[PDB]
Design an enzyme around this catalytic site. Structure first.
Site, PDB file in Angstrom:
ATOM      1  N   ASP A  21       0.781  -1.093  -0.092  1.00  0.00           N
ATOM      2  CA  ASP A  21       0.056   0.052  -0.066  1.00  0.00           C
ATOM      3  C   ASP A  21       0.819   1.142  -0.031  1.00  0.00           C
ATOM      4  OD1 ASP A  21      -2.936  -0.839   0.420  1.00  0.00           O
ATOM      5  OD2 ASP A  21      -1.737  -2.131   1.552  1.00  0.00           O
ATOM      6  N   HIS A  23       0.601   3.663  -2.400  1.00  0.00           N
ATOM      7  CA  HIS A  23      -0.461   4.955  -2.701  1.00  0.00           C
ATOM      8  C   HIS A  23       0.587   5.913  -3.293  1.00  0.00           C
ATOM      9  CE1 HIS A  23      -4.349   3.585  -0.958  1.00  0.00           C
ATOM     10  NE2 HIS A  23      -3.653   2.827  -0.517  1.00  0.00           N
ATOM     11  N   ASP A  65      -2.611  -1.462  -2.902  1.00  0.00           N
ATOM     12  CA  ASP A  65      -2.386  -0.586  -3.961  1.00  0.00           C
ATOM     13  C   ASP A  65      -1.255   0.455  -3.921  1.00  0.00           C
ATOM     14  OD1 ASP A  65      -4.936  -1.355  -3.588  1.00  0.00           O
ATOM     15  OD2 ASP A  65      -6.001   0.361  -4.459  1.00  0.00           O
ATOM     16  N   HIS A 101      -7.026  -2.139 -10.848  1.00  0.00           N
ATOM     17  CA  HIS A 101      -6.691  -1.453 -11.726  1.00  0.00           C
ATOM     18  C   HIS A 101      -7.658  -1.242 -12.843  1.00  0.00           C
ATOM     19  CE1 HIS A 101      -5.449  -5.563 -12.076  1.00  0.00           C
ATOM     20  NE2 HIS A 101      -6.040  -5.486 -13.356  1.00  0.00           N
ATOM     21  N   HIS A 225      -4.657  -0.202   5.146  1.00  0.00           N
ATOM     22  CA  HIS A 225      -3.618   1.016   5.599  1.00  0.00           C
ATOM     23  C   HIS A 225      -2.976   0.682   6.930  1.00  0.00           C
ATOM     24  CE1 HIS A 225      -5.727   3.975   2.863  1.00  0.00           C
ATOM     25  NE2 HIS A 225      -5.392   2.784   2.285  1.00  0.00           N
TER      26      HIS A 225
HETATM   27  C1  LIG Z   1       2.698  -3.168 -15.449  1.00  0.00           C
HETATM   28  C2  LIG Z   1       3.297  -3.412 -13.924  1.00  0.00           C
HETATM   29  C3  LIG Z   1       3.150  -2.186 -13.059  1.00  0.00           C
HETATM   30  C4  LIG Z   1       4.091  -1.017 -13.678  1.00  0.00           C
HETATM   31  N1  LIG Z   1       1.905  -1.969 -12.889  1.00  0.00           N
HETATM   32  C5  LIG Z   1       1.003  -0.773 -13.412  1.00  0.00           C
HETATM   33  O1  LIG Z   1       1.268  -0.522 -14.472  1.00  0.00           O
HETATM   34  C6  LIG Z   1      -0.120  -0.721 -12.694  1.00  0.00           C
HETATM   35  C7  LIG Z   1      -1.264  -0.038 -13.078  1.00  0.00           C
HETATM   36  C8  LIG Z   1      -1.629   1.074 -14.211  1.00  0.00           C
HETATM   37  C9  LIG Z   1      -0.657   1.317 -15.404  1.00  0.00           C
HETATM   38  C10 LIG Z   1      -1.290   2.116 -16.460  1.00  0.00           C
HETATM   39  C11 LIG Z   1      -2.507   2.758 -16.212  1.00  0.00           C
HETATM   40  O2  LIG Z   1      -2.659   3.389 -17.334  1.00  0.00           O
HETATM   41  C12 LIG Z   1      -3.342   2.123 -15.051  1.00  0.00           C
HETATM   42  C13 LIG Z   1      -2.814   1.543 -14.091  1.00  0.00           C
HETATM   43  S1  LIG Z   1      -0.311  -1.642 -11.359  1.00  0.00           S
HETATM   44  C14 LIG Z   1       1.188  -2.157 -11.638  1.00  0.00           C
HETATM   45  S2  LIG Z   1       2.081  -3.071 -10.557  1.00  0.00           S
HETATM   46 MN   LIG Z   2      -5.799  -3.108  -2.221  1.00  0.00          MN
HETATM   47 MN   LIG Z   3      -4.646   0.513   0.287  1.00  0.00          MN
END
Ligand SMILES: CC[C@@H](C)N1C(=O)/C(=C\c2ccc(O)cc2)SC1=S
Ligand SMILES: [Mn+2]
Ligand SMILES: [Mn+2]
Ligand SMILES: CC[C@@H](C)N1C(=O)/C(=C\c2ccc(O)cc2)SC1=S
EC number: 3.1.-.-
Length: 331
Positions: A21, A23, A65, A101, A225
């Site tokens: 997390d 964030h 997250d 996501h 959290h």
């Molecule tokens: C692709 C692996 C890594 C870099 N990753 C994301 O890109 C993630 C989310 C994301 C990426 C591009 C978007 O437009 C929206 C979410 S979460 C996560 S771990």
């Molecule tokens: Mn979560």
């Molecule tokens: Mn969270």
């Protein structure tokens, strides 16, 4: 001086760094006084990375997250994520269990990155994967990601709960099919948390802590959290966030978790304190002359952020947010 994995014969130990997390890209209190938490968050992230290299971890687990924005992360947020991901990989092999996501293309990129690298693995399904640790330890990951196939959006209360149990049962059967170690990674909310309030909300997957496979050596969880030691058999831990997102986490201790596993010995762990900026909520009936005295006196020597909560109005309130940089919310 090579940079690949070691291969120690008869090695029966496994040092794990578990953080969750992050964030990344979060801006707190946008409705009152917007504060970019990036500098504080990056500072906390640096401390976790250094501790990973300090203790020479064998495997790094990431849950919860990592990005604050689910379906629209900023360029800066994405940059920081890829940055610290690479920093983690230079230390030890990484296993990532992404949260929500809502992008279909993410699973494709996740599988691609996993296929081209031997130091990072993305678990985005219920399919168990075997990974190799820093010193050549065989580690089987039992992933329990957020339920897809529109089951979270629409499912009968009977089948869905039975669906979750069935998935957990198969993870149990496959956890017995392990070589050396077996780690459980889940992105859900443990039934009856005491007393983490304010989640999500958001959609929640409620799972009894007894349903988590007992044959695994460690249960890595996320999404909440606050730090939580759910149980000891098997050792189930929510690391918590690295910073204090809102004032509900005022009395929280933020940081990461260092877990060491042995073949014969039971699991032991230490908390890695990130030491983020503190939070405080001041309560008053009315903001009178005495209240103004207390507020200015406290915010004077407070290294964190301050919220002031009062009941009813009583005359024009002075520009407290103007004279006090710490005051981020008078609600
Ligand atoms: C692709 C692996 C890594 C870099 N990753 C994301 O890109 C993630 C989310 C994301 C990426 C591009 C978007 O437009 C929206 C979410 S979460 C996560 S771990
Ligand atoms: Mn979560
Ligand atoms: Mn969270
Ligand atoms: C590793 C990037 C590579 C697979 N790639 C894209 O992702 C490309 C384009 C693209 C990706 C995602 C979108 O939403 C739009 C275009 S082109 C190209 S090479």
């Amino acid at each position: 001086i090579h940079h690949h994995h070691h291969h120690v014969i008869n090695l029966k130990e496994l040092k794990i760094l578990h953080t969750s997390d992050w964030h990344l890209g979060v801006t707190s209190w946008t409705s009152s006084r917007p504060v970019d938490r990036r500098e504080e968050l990056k500072k906390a992230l640096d401390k976790v990375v250094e501790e990973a290299e300090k203790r020479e971890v064998d495997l790094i687990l990431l849950t919860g997250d990592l990005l604050h924005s689910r379906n629209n992360p900023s360029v800066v947020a994405l940059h920081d994520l890829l940055d610290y991901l690479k920093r983690m990989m230079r230390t030890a092999p990484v296993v990532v269990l992404p949260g929500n996501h809502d992008w279909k293309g993410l699973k494709l990129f996740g599988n691609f990155v996993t296929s081209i690298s031997s130091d990072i693995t993305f678990v985005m399904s219920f399919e168990p994967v075997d990974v190799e640790a820093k010193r050549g330890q065989k580690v089987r990951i039992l992933p329990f990601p957020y339920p897809d196939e529109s089951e979270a959006l629409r499912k009968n209360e009977g089948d869905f709960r039975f669906f979750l149990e069935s998935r957990l049962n198969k993870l149990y059967e496959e956890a017995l099919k392990k070589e050396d170690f077996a780690i459980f990674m889940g992105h859900f909310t443990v039934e009856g948390l005491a007393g983490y309030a304010g989640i999500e909300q958001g959609r929640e997957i409620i799972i009894n802590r007894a349903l988590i496979p007992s044959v695994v050596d460690y249960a890595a969880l996320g999404h909440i959290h606050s730090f939580r030691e759910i149980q000891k058999q098997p050792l189930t831990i929510y690391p918590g966030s690295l910073i204090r997102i809102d004032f509900g986490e005022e009395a929280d201790e933020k940081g990461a978790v260092f877990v060491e596993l042995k073949r014969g010995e039971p699991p032991r762990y230490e908390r890695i304190d990130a030491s983020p900026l503190p939070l405080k909520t001041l309560y008053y009936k009315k903001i009178d002359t005495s209240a103004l005295k207390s507020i200015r006196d406290f915010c004077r020597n407070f290294p964190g952020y301050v919220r002031v909560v009062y009941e009813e109005d009583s005359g024009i309130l002075p520009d407290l947010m103007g004279e006090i940089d710490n005051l981020v919310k008078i609600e």
